[PDB]
Amino acid sequence: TRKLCSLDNGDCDQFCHEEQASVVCSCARGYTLADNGKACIPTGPYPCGKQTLER
Amino acid sequence: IVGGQECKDGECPWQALLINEENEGFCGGTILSEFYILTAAHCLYQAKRFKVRVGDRNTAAEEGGEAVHEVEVVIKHNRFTKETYDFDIAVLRLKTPITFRMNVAPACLPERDWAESTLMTQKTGIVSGFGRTHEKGRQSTRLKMLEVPYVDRNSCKLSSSFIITQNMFCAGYDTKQEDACQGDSGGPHVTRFKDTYFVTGIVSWGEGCARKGKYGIYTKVTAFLKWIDRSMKTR
Numbered sequence: 153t154r155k156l157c158s159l160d161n162g163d164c165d166q167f168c169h170e171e172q173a174s175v176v177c178s179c180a181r182g183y184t185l186a187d188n189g190k191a192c193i194p195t196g197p198y199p200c201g202k203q204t205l206e207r
Numbered sequence: 208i209v210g211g212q213e214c215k216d217g218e219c220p221w222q223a224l225l226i227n228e229e230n231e232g233f234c235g236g237t238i239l240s241e242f243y244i245l246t247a248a249h250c251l252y253q254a255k256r257f258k259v260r261v262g263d264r265n266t267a268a269e270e271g272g273e274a275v276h277e278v279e280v281v282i283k284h285n286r287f288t289k290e291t292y293d294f295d296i297a298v299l300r301l302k303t304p305i306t307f308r309m310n311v312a313p314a315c316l317p318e319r320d321w322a323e324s325t326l327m328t329q330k331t332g333i334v335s336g337f338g339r340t341h342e343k344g345r346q347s348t349r350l351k352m353l354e355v356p357y358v359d360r361n362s363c364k365l366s367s368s369f370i371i372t373q374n375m376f377c378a379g380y381d382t383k384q385e386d387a388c389q390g391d392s393g394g395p396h397v398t399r400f401k402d403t404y405f406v407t408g409i410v411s412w413g414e415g416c417a418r419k420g421k422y423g424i425y426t427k428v429t430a431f432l433k434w435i436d437r438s439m440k441t442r
């Protein structure tokens with residue numbers, strides 16, 4: 153047993169969409185999915201939704 | 208914004224201001240891409256013609272960073288019923304691309320499922336805009352942002368003296384005198400999830416501002432994402 157985009161959003165950085173019994177993460181346009189199938193990596197210098205400050 | 212906190216450097220990079228002919232910012236908007244700005248349908252009536260300014264953090268001085276762009280196409284939701292304020296949403300396509308920089312960045316669009324749940328399940332969202340700071344008071348000049356908690360559908364209905372439809376949602380304080388106000392129409396109600404900011408609604412209307420007993424209401428972006436991508440392709 154494994155399931156639940158609930159638990160802790162299935163450790164997706166962004167979109168969690170449970171398929172069959174697998175969490176399955178996805179990213180917003182402008183983010184590439186990191187090989188670990190959980191994290192979302194910015195593709196461009198100013199990705200959406202990130203605060204453009206002295207970060 | 209009545210009783211907000213200030214958008215510090217780079218803190219609210221998606222805030223667009225819609226300025227009329229005499230440079231009077233009559234509404235706000237949310238940057239979505241290099242060409243498309245999201246705003247709320249009725250604002251299109253407050254000027255014969257307008258332009259969108261991004262990068263603007265303070266209305267008064269031209270400290271650089273501010274960049275105006277002309278609108279090419281205005282795609283409005285054809286079902287906006289002015290007397291209910293239902294379907295209050297419109298997409299503006301700008302003529303010249305917005306150049307991103309510190310204080311200039313698109314907010315992220317979510318997806319209908321994971322938006323409903325997760326984003327509307329969060330207890331709080333953020334709202335901001337160059338709009339009235341007190342009701343019967345001046346607009347803002349400094350970009351104010353305010354944390355507005357999500358309010359459940361039934362209480363929202365029970366408080367508002369006008370029918371709230373499933374294209375609207377309430378967020379605001381019952382008694383705490385803090386809330387979005389006149390002149391924040393079209394502005395972002397964004398929700399933060401793990402440092403990423405997702406657009407969940409746009410400032411529509413509300414009975415006055417910070418009014419004891421009522422809440423500010425926003426158009427539910429979750430019901431329109433498909434319509435948004437329609438117009439972003441152009442339809």
Ligand SMILES: CC(=N)N1CC[C@H](Oc2ccc([C@H](Cc3ccc4ccc(C(=N)N)cc4c3)C(=O)O)cc2)C1
Pocket residue numbers: 289290291292369386387388389390391392410411412413414415416417422423424
């Ligand atoms: C006519 C009709 N049948 N209606 C159905 C609902 C709709 O709601 C409105 C629209 C504009 C106003 C403005 C004021 C007005 C306009 C915009 C606002 C935006 C945000 C908030 C807020 N509290 N978060 C308040 C606003 C109040 C007026 O001049 O009176 C007040 C209420 C009217």
Ligand SMILES: [Ca+2]
Pocket residue numbers: 263264265266267268269270273
């Ligand atoms: Ca300025």
